[PDB]
Amino acid sequence: TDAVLELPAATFDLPLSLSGGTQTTLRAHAGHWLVIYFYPKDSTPGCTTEGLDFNALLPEFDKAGAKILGVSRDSVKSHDNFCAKQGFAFPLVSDGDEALCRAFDVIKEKNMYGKQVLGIERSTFLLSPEGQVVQAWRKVKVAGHADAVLAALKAHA
Numbered sequence: 135t136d137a138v139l140e141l142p143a144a145t146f147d148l149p150l151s152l153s154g155g156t157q158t159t160l161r162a163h164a165g166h167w168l169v170i171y172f173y174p175k176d177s178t179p180g181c182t183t184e185g186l187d188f189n190a191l192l193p194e195f196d197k198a199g200a201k202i203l204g205v206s207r208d209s210v211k212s213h214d215n216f217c218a219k220q221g222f223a224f225p226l227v228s229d230g231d232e233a234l235c236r237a238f239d240v241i242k243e244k245n246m247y248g249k250q251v252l253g254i255e256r257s258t259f260l261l262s263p264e265g266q267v268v269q270a271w272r273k274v275k276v277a278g279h280a281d282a283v284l285a286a287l288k289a290h291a
């Protein structure tokens with residue numbers, strides 16, 4: 135009823151490689167809210183702006199017991215370098231095989247260059263304590279986004 139997106143059951147048990155060398159799974163986050171934001175490329179202007187915006191709001195997400203994960207298909211080492219340079223205090227998922235991206239249907243196609251070109255569309259989701267995807271943002275506008283996600287989380291919580 136409250137879900138806006140249905141994920142395959144296996145999605146919740148995918149091993150997600152994090153910055154810092156550990157793995158997580160979505161099921162491991164049971165019992166608390168989770169914000170998952172997908173972005174196209176480490177260390178680019180929009181992605182850096184978005185990450186810094188979420189980072190600045192961490193205490194507000196903490197107040198709500200929520201955790202955040204950023205996701206792109208960059209490597210663990212790329213993510214480590216990005217986190218260290220920017221001072222991020224939340225993890226980044228190295229979704230190199232785009233398994234998590236496909237589950238959330240964020241790999242979108244565009245007819246460009248006389249080709250069918252597939253890429254990550256900037257998108258964010260709110261996962262309830264019982265693992266339901268209860269809100270989505272697609273084709274994200276970075277300006278104001280993290281603030282809007284926080285407001286929606288508060289409203290839902």
Ligand code: NA
Nearest residue numbers: 177215216219
């Ligand atoms: Na960087």
Ligand code: NA
Nearest residue numbers: 163166168262
């Ligand atoms: Na959760």
Ligand code: NA
Nearest residue numbers: 269270271272
């Ligand atoms: Na929406």
